[PDB]
């Protein structure tokens, strides 16, 4: 669908109606637009005003990016972010990240509401994201699918290193400062289309794959955002325990602002 | 995504509602060498396919499949006799417009019935599985009949499906049956549904037996999900029509028959 | 489908009168095995360009050629270079060159490729002689044979089951166990899965836990079209990598199965 050309567009219209030069792209999952409150100087671009942005037909949820700095740290963040439910293909669903890698941004956080699989998380817990399994990628929903393009990178990117690990430990390591009675979950997580929740049986085969946590996006745009070079890492906030058998966000918001810190310098 | 606006499926439960004075409640929908249960309705009106606004038909003439207006042991209903697949190169859209005709037509309830292999060892042909619940395998993967923009007057973006096989409905079949008398018990199981139509190499059926399916089949889901969302009372049947190889080493009237007996323990609108 | 019957015959016409060779065997040649176009004698080319109908190889390395001759004394044709469902080819594209070996009355189709070993015991350079597949595409709507069934090609339901031709499997075991060679000859199961990037870790232990002994993006499409049109249908993966099944941290080959497809073409039974 998109060229070149039409990322390239549509980074030199935000590069010149903003002087915000953000490092981090930062993806809000629902529940966590509240993360924009922790932004300073902030600039507000609504997907309706930006050349070839997606945006939805749906009424209400309008969609934007707003540039600013977290906790000193350059960062521009998506409130309202895009799923295959939808109808859209993955190379609208993904077309920011590469946008974002245009504008210079080198590190993509990654963050989603997720049903519990593993047996020990509770609601309100946060799990660090070591891994994923793509069970829309298995089948042909690729967002790399079609011909390549090595300005963004290789044809055939590896994705077993996706989820940095210097990241890994830095949060580990951070999150035992905040004085918090649960500890900091780990885990695998699995995407599935969706939109209509999971059953029962459907649950078990997720647990038996060995995924923590499901739900219905982020794994494209860490595919797409790796084929371009971007340092990734990510967070579920688990929303439910999915059923096997027949505050918080704001907590998550503000553990992905101390960790800007942490994020390396250009 | 869905090619059909509101408007055209009420134009199609309008045509239906001015054409026929019956007012089913209850839908069914009609499985491989299930056509035999429309034999057993009183005061039966036909409605083929092609004569319907809206409706999908084949390309292929040979068969234009039909509805069917009726009584079934005195229970007002409308039949699915012959249904939509995946395979067969149809939308999921599509495969799955009379269920929310039959929704705008004042149905409260859907049977779904189909042919499937068995995958539990315990299963025998010939067998009828009482269906427990299902994995949506083409679901997982993008092919999910609700994708798309939302539409709030049928039901919400995220429906849960883990309730989907109604349980008073499930308790009431296994208490029926058990007072009907035959040699064989009511199976109970999960459904898996594969897009096919190639039929599952050894390789695949271990993976589905692994996965916890009881049997396997190409067709329903989709059917479940959509009545679902609308907000239809759900339950259904496979037949066990063959037992699937795991080593590189009648019965349909009796379900046509069960489920006829089976109107009378539905709920009242 | 966008193709028509019409569309496989004049590209099956076209071939037919542009060539006096008529192959028995068709042989698909994946990532690496194009060097056994060198082993034919009397070879005829076409570029896949200059086929009516026909797709392109987009990867580098499929060098995009229909090439006829004689292989060890038996006629055949090969595909050297395929295409995959990574390079955006829906899989009735993919698979439209079975089709015509079937018109052009092929009866034998073989198919290899490169593929990531699964199995522990496997070791890079091996060569699986494929028993089973997996076809993930498939459980979710990805099928070759999704639509309309043209009853001139077969069956709307064809089974899988005895896709691996067994005669073909037994004659394999054998005449490579009169070649001396180190490592025998694996056999297993082979998964399909879309690509175009590499699987995580967690995904390779899914697709251990299902079976799967080798994997790659390819070949099953062409298997299923195949079998559906009844020719006989035998396959090899050349294990090129083992692939990583654990979180780490710091804190020739493609010569040996050429030359054992060509040794293999005399025990392929005749017309």
Same mark, same amino acid.
């Given at each position: 669908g998109y060229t070149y050309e039409d990322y390239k567009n549509t980074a030199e219209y935000l590069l010149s109606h903003t002087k915000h030069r953000p490092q981090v792209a930062i993806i809000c999952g629902?529940? !966590?637009?509240? !993360? =924009?409150?922790? !932004? =300073?100087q902030a600039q507000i671009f609504d997907?309706?005003?930006?050349?070839?942005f997606p945006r939805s037909?749906?009424?209400?949820?309008?969609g934007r990016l707003v540039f600013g700095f977290l906790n000193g740290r350059a960062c521009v963040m998506m409130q309202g972010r895009f799923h295959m439910?939808?109808?859209?293909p993955l190379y609208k669903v993904t077309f920011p990240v590469r946008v974002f890698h245009l504008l210079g941004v080198d590190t993509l956080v990654v963050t989603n509401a997720a049903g519990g699989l593993n047996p020990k998380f509770e609601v309100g817990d946060i799990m660090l994201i070591r891994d994923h399994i793509n069970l829309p990628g298995f089948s042909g929903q690729n967002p790399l699918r079609g011909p390549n393009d090595e300005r963004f990178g290789d044809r055939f990117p590896a994705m077993?290193?996706?989820?940095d690990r210097t990241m890994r430990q830095r949060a580990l390591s951070t999150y035992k400062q905040m004085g918090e009675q649960r500890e900091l979950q780990e885990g695998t997580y699995v995407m599935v289309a969706g939109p209509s929740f999971e059953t029962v049986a459907e649950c078990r085969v997720l647990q038996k794959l060995g995924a923590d946590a499901v739900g219905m996006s982020t794994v494209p745009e860490v595919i797409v955002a790796r084929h371009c070079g971007l340092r990734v890492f990510g967070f579920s906030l688990i929303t439910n325990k999915v059923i096997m058998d027949y505050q918080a966000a704001q907590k998550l918001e503000q553990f992905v602002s101390i960790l800007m810190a942490s994020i390396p310098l250009p």
């Amino acid at each position: 669908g998109y060229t070149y050309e039409d990322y390239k567009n549509t980074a030199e219209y935000l590069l010149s109606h903003t002087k915000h030069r953000p490092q981090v792209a930062i993806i809000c999952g629902s529940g !966590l637009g509240g !993360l =924009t409150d922790k !932004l =300073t100087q902030a600039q507000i671009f609504d997907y309706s005003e930006i050349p070839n942005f997606p945006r939805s037909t749906v009424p209400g949820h309008a969609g934007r990016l707003v540039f600013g700095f977290l906790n000193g740290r350059a960062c521009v963040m998506m409130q309202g972010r895009f799923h295959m439910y939808e109808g859209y293909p993955l190379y609208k669903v993904t077309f920011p990240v590469r946008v974002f890698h245009l504008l210079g941004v080198d590190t993509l956080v990654v963050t989603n509401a997720a049903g519990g699989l593993n047996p020990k998380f509770e609601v309100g817990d946060i799990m660090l994201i070591r891994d994923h399994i793509n069970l829309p990628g298995f089948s042909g929903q690729n967002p790399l699918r079609g011909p390549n393009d090595e300005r963004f990178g290789d044809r055939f990117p590896a994705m077993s290193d996706a989820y940095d690990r210097t990241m890994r430990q830095r949060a580990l390591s951070t999150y035992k400062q905040m004085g918090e009675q649960r500890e900091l979950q780990e885990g695998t997580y699995v995407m599935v289309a969706g939109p209509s929740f999971e059953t029962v049986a459907e649950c078990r085969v997720l647990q038996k794959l060995g995924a923590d946590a499901v739900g219905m996006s982020t794994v494209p745009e860490v595919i797409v955002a790796r084929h371009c070079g971007l340092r990734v890492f990510g967070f579920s906030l688990i929303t439910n325990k999915v059923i096997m058998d027949y505050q918080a966000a704001q907590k998550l918001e503000q553990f992905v602002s101390i960790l800007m810190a942490s994020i390396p310098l250009p």
